[PDB]
Amino acid sequence: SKGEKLFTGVVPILVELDGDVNGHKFSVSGEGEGDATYGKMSLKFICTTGKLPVPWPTLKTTLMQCFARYPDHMKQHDFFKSAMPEGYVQERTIFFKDDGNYKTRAEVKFEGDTLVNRIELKGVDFKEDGNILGHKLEYNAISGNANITADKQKNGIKAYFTIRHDVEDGSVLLADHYQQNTPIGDGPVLLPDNHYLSTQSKQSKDPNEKRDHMVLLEFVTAAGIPL
Fold first, then answer.
1. Which of 166, 200, 159 is nearest to 69 (CA)?
2. Nearest 5°: phi and psi at 47?
3. Which residues lie across from 161 on neighbouring strands?
4. Neighbours of 46 (CB within 10 A)
5. Diameter of the chain measured on Cα atoms
6. Closest CA to 224 of 192, 178, 184
7. Is the distance from CB of 17 to CB of 54 less than 8 angstroms?
8. CB-side neighbour CA atoms (13 Å) of 212
9. Which CATH superfamily is domain 3-222 in?
10. Where does residue 102 rank: exposed (0-12), middle (13-18), buried (19+ CB within 10 A)?
11. How far is Cα 123 from Cα 138, in angstroms, rounded to an integer?
12. Cα distance between residue 191 and residue 81, in whole Å
């Protein structure tokens, strides 16, 4: 596969999310640019249905690991680009400690020159007055590692990690992520040795934007296999 060549330049991004969390229905769209050479994404997301009924930080991981920078010595481990342009399915369960869970299914693929991330999210068993539906989580940066392993059975990958969300009382809300990806096309893909993706995130607001929204600058770097 030559999916990697699709990412040497700056790539426009389009994101669409339809969500239902305890019957609160909402939609999110996003736009921006990926520059995988530098592991970079710059993005702006908007709630198109009014007020987001969950905190923006709980949606960050759901809302494109194809833009990670794989160092040259690790290029043979980049499943995410190998699947393009036909794309991959990305499925998670996210278990929020002592609260509900999200189930997500996304298709990530090229539509012409645009990289499109289309997502359905279903959340169940949330506490209507807990830290999520109660909007009690810090709006600050989620950085850290996503652990990747081959799923030779499905010809894709699994991933796993725990996100640590700060709560506004000084406590921490743990979100355990379980991830499966599979190629959409039947062409060959790269099945990796164990490694991780390291994400550095800066989150911000646009002072001219009236819609409920989130601005993100992300840098993502493949690591864990030495030179």
1. 200
2. -85, 115
3. 177
4. 18
5. 50
6. 192
7. no
8. 15
9. Green fluorescent protein (2.40.155.10)
10. buried
11. 20
12. 11
